[PDB]
Amino acid sequence: PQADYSGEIAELYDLVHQGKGKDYHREAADLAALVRRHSPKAASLLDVACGTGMHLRHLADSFGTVEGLELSADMLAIARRRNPDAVLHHGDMRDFSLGRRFSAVTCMFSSIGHLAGQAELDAALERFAAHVLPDGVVVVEPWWFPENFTPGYVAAGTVEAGGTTVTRVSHSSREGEATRIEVHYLVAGPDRGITHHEESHRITLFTREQYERAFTAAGLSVEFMPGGPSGRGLFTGLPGA
């Protein structure tokens, strides 16, 4: 079933990622510091595929003006409630045009893997370049590479919130040039009983040199740092190559 971050799946996103130990406060701090390394004076940040706008809520404490772009209306609805004073655009990272430039353009937690093929990767990175200030920095957190992805990987966790128990379990396979991650949820609580939910995605296993080539074609210089927020590293790009 779903591949579009919507309905109950969208409502469950923050809770399950908090449950899994994702620390958006620490990630934002680190992002902020990294942005300031490359661009001492940095003042504004666009978060592209900002999802439920968690990083944006914390980055607003480091940057004077933040903005987001998100494809999923249901994710976007959450992020707007969380960030009621920022402008958050409903739109596609492949094609957007905001009429303005930012000190940082960020794209976090491997949202970039929802792109297929070099053409789409090149297009996004070109849009990212089209929205970054001449002394700013673009930051893209890749998906795993084909060489380091671990097929067969199972994640399972349970979290409780407000009397509701939520169990999420994922299985990931190598399905050609993408990971297939299939994720099932069981939600249960005394009054609502039990419901079952599912999502399934192809997340593209772009090689390191594929991302590098996307940055380059977009006029950015590209550097890679191993590790990073989720283990997959981080690319940063500076205009002027």
Ligand X SMILES: Nc1ncnc2c1ncn2[C@@H]1O[C@H](CSCC[C@H](N)C(=O)O)[C@@H](O)[C@H]1O
Ligand Y SMILES: Cc1cn([C@H]2C[C@H](O)[C@@H](COP(=O)(O)OP(=O)(O)O[C@H]3O[C@H](C)[C@@H](O)[C@H](N)[C@H]3O)O2)c(=O)[nH]c1=O
* Residue numbering of the annotated binding site for S-adenosyl-L-methionine: 5, 13, 24, 49-50, 70, 92-93, 108
By a kind-dependent CB cut-off of 5 to 8 A, residue 85 interacts, out of ligand Y, ligand X, its own copies, none, with none
Q: How far apart are CA 47 and CA 128, in angstroms?
A: 10
State how far Cα 153 lies from the chain centre: 20
Q: Which range, of 54-62, 67-75, 81-89, 142-150, touches ligand Y by CB under 6 A?
A: 142-150
C-alpha dihedral, 98 to 71 to 107 to 5, nearest 10°: 160
By a kind-dependent CB cut-off of 5 to 8 A, residue 173 interacts, out of ligand X, ligand Y, its own copies, none, with its own copies
Q: Which of residues 180-199 bind ligand Y (CB under 6 A)?
A: 181, 183
In whole angstroms, how close is the CB of 192 to its own copies at the nearest point? 8
Q: How far apart are CA 228 and CA 18, in angstroms?
A: 18
Closest residue by Cα to residue 13 from 86, 60, 94, 70: 70
Q: Which of residues 147-166 bind its own copies (CB under 8 A)?
A: 151-154, 156-158, 160, 165
Q: Which range, of 36-44, 55-63, 104-112, 211-219, touches ligand Y by CB under 6 A?
A: 104-112
Q: How far apart are CA 66 and CA 230, in angstroms?
A: 23
144 makes contact with ligand Y (CB under 6 A): yes
SS3 106: strand
Other C-beta atoms closer than 10 Å to the C-beta of 48 total: 28
Closest residue by Cα to residue 204 from 155, 152, 142, 138: 142
In whole angstroms, how close is the CB of 167 to its own copies at the nearest point? 5
Provide the β-strand partners of residue 184: 169, 198
Using CB under 6 A, list all residues that contact ligand Y: 20, 109-111, 144, 149-150, 153, 155, 170, 172, 179, 181, 183, 201, 230-231
Using CB under 6 A, list all residues that contact ligand X: 5, 49-51, 54-55, 69-72, 75, 92-94, 108-109, 111, 114
